[PDB]
Scaffold this motif. Structure first.
Motif, mmCIF file in Angstrom:
data_model
loop_
_atom_site.group_PDB
_atom_site.id
_atom_site.type_symbol
_atom_site.label_atom_id
_atom_site.label_comp_id
_atom_site.label_asym_id
_atom_site.label_seq_id
_atom_site.Cartn_x
_atom_site.Cartn_y
_atom_site.Cartn_z
ATOM 1 N N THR A 5 30.752 38.999 33.310
ATOM 2 C CA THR A 5 30.578 38.477 34.543
ATOM 3 C C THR A 5 29.150 38.741 35.747
ATOM 4 N N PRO A 7 28.232 37.696 39.542
ATOM 5 C CA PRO A 7 28.925 36.910 40.763
ATOM 6 C C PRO A 7 28.022 36.436 41.289
ATOM 7 N N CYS A 33 44.020 36.945 38.577
ATOM 8 C CA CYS A 33 42.386 36.330 39.111
ATOM 9 C C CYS A 33 42.906 34.449 38.907
ATOM 10 N N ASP A 55 34.410 29.271 34.377
ATOM 11 C CA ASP A 55 34.306 30.140 35.969
ATOM 12 C C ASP A 55 35.390 30.268 36.717
ATOM 13 N N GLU A 56 35.036 32.262 37.106
ATOM 14 C CA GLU A 56 35.883 32.777 37.845
ATOM 15 C C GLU A 56 35.935 32.437 39.814
ATOM 16 N N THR A 58 36.590 33.647 43.071
ATOM 17 C CA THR A 58 36.639 34.678 43.902
ATOM 18 C C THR A 58 37.041 35.020 45.671
ATOM 19 N N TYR A 88 31.959 32.723 43.276
ATOM 20 C CA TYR A 88 32.536 33.122 42.018
ATOM 21 C C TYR A 88 32.138 33.887 41.065
ATOM 22 N N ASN A 89 32.150 34.597 39.336
ATOM 23 C CA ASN A 89 32.180 34.973 39.105
ATOM 24 C C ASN A 89 31.682 33.677 37.859
ATOM 25 N N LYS A 90 30.848 33.997 37.544
ATOM 26 C CA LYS A 90 30.034 33.068 36.037
ATOM 27 C C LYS A 90 30.253 34.027 34.512
#
Length: 112
Positions: A5, A7, A33, A55-56, A58, A88-90
């Motif tokens: 990932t 950020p 998560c 996508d996460e 965060t 987000y985390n990609k």
């Protein structure tokens, strides 16, 4: 699900209905998560084009959302007026496989 990932963050304007145009959540099983589950057509999120299903999510406006329920995060985003910064985390994987994955049965999500 061993996926690297990176950020990132995006500032999105709220639409007339106070929506950015994403669903956030994940599986029924415990997960520490939270994930973007759906990006809705023609909304700020879609037109911007940065975020995608899988996508996460965060944080929000420089605050981590870790340890919060999807309802709490949604409430947080809904209460921010006009404009919101989504952190987000990609996930570095096939985007279409990520979409399908979070399209699956038993996925719980809140639209905001």
């Amino acid at each position: 699900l061993g996926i690297p990932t990176v950020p990132g963050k995006v500032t999105l304007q709220k639409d007339a209905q106070n929506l950015i145009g994403i669903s956030i959540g994940g599986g029924a099983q415990y997960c520490p998560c939270l994930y973007i589950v759906q990006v809705f057509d023609n909304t700020p999120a879609a037109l911007d084009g940065t975020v995608a299903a899988g996508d996460e999510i965060t944080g929000v406006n420089g605050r981590s959302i870790k340890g919060k329920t999807k309802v709490e995060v949604a409430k947080m985003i809904q209460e921010v007026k006009g404009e919101v910064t989504i952190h987000y985390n990609k996930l570095q994987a096939d985007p279409k496989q990520l979409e399908v994955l979070f399209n699956g049965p038993g996925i719980e999500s809140v639209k905001i």
